Amino acid sequence: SRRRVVITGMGMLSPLGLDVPSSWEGILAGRSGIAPIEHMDLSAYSTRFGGSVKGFNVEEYLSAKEARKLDLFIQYGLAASFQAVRDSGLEVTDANRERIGVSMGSGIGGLTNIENNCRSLFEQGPRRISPFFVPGSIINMVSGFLSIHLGLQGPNYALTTAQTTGTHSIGMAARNIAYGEADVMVAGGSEMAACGLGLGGFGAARALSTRNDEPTRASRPWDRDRDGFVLSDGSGALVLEELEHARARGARIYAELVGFGMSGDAFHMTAPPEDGAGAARCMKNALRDAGLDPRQVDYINAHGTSTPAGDIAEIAAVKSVFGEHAHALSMSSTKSMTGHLLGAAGAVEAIFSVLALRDQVAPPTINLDNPDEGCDLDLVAHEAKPRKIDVALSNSFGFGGTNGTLVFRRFA
């Protein structure tokens, strides 16, 4: 029968910090992680800024010889995973290694490495493609490399559901544990899409904010002057653990994962429906899965991408699901500070939702100067709001009409 699942470890690289505490300190201070991109020349591009990981030292985790063969999204995914496992205190042994698995996902994976090898191929030839091109670029290799470094022999897979990846990865990993396929999973996502093809491709879709002259103000979810998402890099990982397993070893438990929802919109390849019908269906699935009264929800970490259609669809969905209680909960978009980590967004935002529960505080939506028509909920504008949070919900929505909702609650 279905077992309970708790969070015993977390790890992160974000535009606000090289770990969880430093990132969360930025979140509660209303700090922006967005700046002009330094790592490549973007003068020909319509967007020249984003959320970079600043000062990442891969040699805190991996030998230089190894790191040189891995795309940044793998390096970030391993860093976050190693943090989360260390934070959990779990010791991997012959007795438990078959019961510990990994599901770390990515929306796009090793696009920087694929781009650089494509340049080698076209300008020089196939003899100059790296021998490490495939295992250093394809999405399942965060799970793969992590399992080989720690000796994890449990379920080993990766999701790729665009901007929903981190949320799906955590939810499905929790189902693995619930149904008895594993006792422990490391789950989350990682992304580094800030190369020519990523910035150029989202640019060609006119999906990105073009506020080049004021990057910290670009990401402004539900603000009437928003003009698209801000592309950001990094990784989140959580250690999910069966409750009795965690109790037996005296684990520190941050929160319980009580609910997971998925739904497809079946609407449009990239656009969310205006009424947020798929998002509402997904949240309702998650709340029923958690055995909750919707009035129990205290805090929602929105998807909150700073796109015109996405932000207003999320208000519509929250009003449809929560009715008058929509006016009592707090909802914020931490993408106002971090930007959109794409396949890692749901992973870092699950961590922020768990820390909202630990610290009893709703993070702010910065830059919400002039809320748009109908955006009249408590969106925690400008400043962090201390408040009672027993139940927190993290939402994600992606290309393909793919929706995920996680429901966390305090554990006693």
Ligand X SMILES: COc1cc(NC(C)=O)c(OC)cc1Cl
- Which 166-195 positions form the footprint of a second copy (CB under 8 A)? 168, 172, 175, 179, 181
- Asked if 77 is part of the footprint of a second copy (rule: CB under 8 A), the reply reads no
- Asked if 345 is part of the footprint of a second copy (rule: CB under 8 A), the reply reads no
List binders of ligand X among 361-380 (CB under 6 A). none
CB of 156 to a second copy, least distance (A): 3
Report how far residue 76's alpha carbon sits from residue 178's, in angstroms, rounded to the nearest whole number.
28
SS3 391: strand
For 80, the token pair is 């976050």
Q: Which stretch binds ligand X (CB under 6 A): 4-12, 60-68, 308-316, 346-354?
A: 60-68
SS3 373: coil
CB of 129 to ligand X, least distance (A): 16
Report how far residue 101's alpha carbon sits from residue 172's, in angstroms, rounded to the nearest whole number.
12
Rank residues 55 and 125 by Cβ distance to a second copy and give the closer one: 125
List binders of ligand X among 263-292 (CB under 6 A). 269
- CB under 5 to 8 A by kind: which of ligand X, a second copy, none does 330 bind? none
List binders of ligand X among 384-403 (CB under 6 A). none
Q: Which of 95, 78, 87 is nearest to 150 (CA)?
A: 78
- Asked if 143 is part of the footprint of a second copy (rule: CB under 8 A), the reply reads yes
Asked if residue 163 lies in contact with residue 303, where contact means CB atoms within 8 angstroms, the answer is yes
- Residue 217: Cβ within 10 Å count: 17
Rank residues 32 and 52 by Cβ distance to a second copy and give the closer one: 52
Which of 102, 286, 316, 329 binds a second copy (CB under 8 A)? It is: 102
Q: Which of 77, 10, 3 is nearest to 343 (CA)?
A: 77
Asked if residue 105 lies in contact with residue 168, where contact means CB atoms within 8 angstroms, the answer is yes
- Asked if 65 is part of the footprint of ligand X (rule: CB under 6 A), the reply reads yes
Q: Which stretch binds ligand X (CB under 6 A): 62-70, 86-94, 221-229, 392-400?
A: 62-70
List binders of a second copy among 224-283 (CB under 8 A). 262-270, 278, 281
Phi, psi (degrees; rounded to nearest 5) at 156: -130, 105
Site string for ligand X, 128-167 (x = CB under 6 A): -----------------x--xx------------------
- CB under 5 to 8 A by kind: which of a second copy, ligand X, none does 65 bind? ligand X
For 141, the token pair is 């290799």
Report how far residue 268's alpha carbon sits from residue 281's, in angstroms, rounded to the nearest whole number.
16
Cα diameter, the chain: 64
Q: Which stretch binds ligand X (CB under 6 A): 63-71, 103-111, 281-289, 325-333?
A: 63-71
Report how far residue 247's alpha carbon sits from residue 142's, in angstroms, rounded to the nearest whole number.
28
Q: Which residues contact 366 (CB under 8 A, 6 or more apart)?
A: 30, 32, 219, 220, 336, 337, 382
Q: Which of 214, 222, 316, 306 is nearest to 275 (CA)?
A: 316
- CB under 5 to 8 A by kind: which of ligand X, a second copy, none does 172 bind? a second copy
List binders of ligand X among 171-230 (CB under 6 A). none
Which of 81, 140, 301, 396 binds a second copy (CB under 8 A)? It is: 140
List binders of a second copy among 382-401 (CB under 8 A). 398-401
Q: Check residue 392 and report its DSSP letter.
A: E
Rank residues 30 and 135 by Cβ distance to a second copy and give the closer one: 135
Burial class, 130, CB count within 10 angstroms (exposed 0-12 / middle 13-18 / buried 19+):
middle
Which of 57, 63, 127, 250 binds ligand X (CB under 6 A)? It is: 63
Q: Which of 163, 170, 129, 172 is nearest to 271 (CA)?
A: 163
Rank residues 11 and 278 by Cβ distance to a second copy and give the closer one: 278
- Residue 308: Cβ within 10 Å count: 13
- Asked if 407 is part of the footprint of a second copy (rule: CB under 8 A), the reply reads no
Give the residue nearest to ligand X (CB).
Answer: 66
- Asked if 148 is part of the footprint of a second copy (rule: CB under 8 A), the reply reads yes
Q: How far is CA 282 from CA 240, 244, 245, 315, in A?
A: 21, 28, 29, 14
Which parts of this chain interact with ligand X (CB under 6 A)?
A: 63, 65-66, 69, 145, 148-149, 269
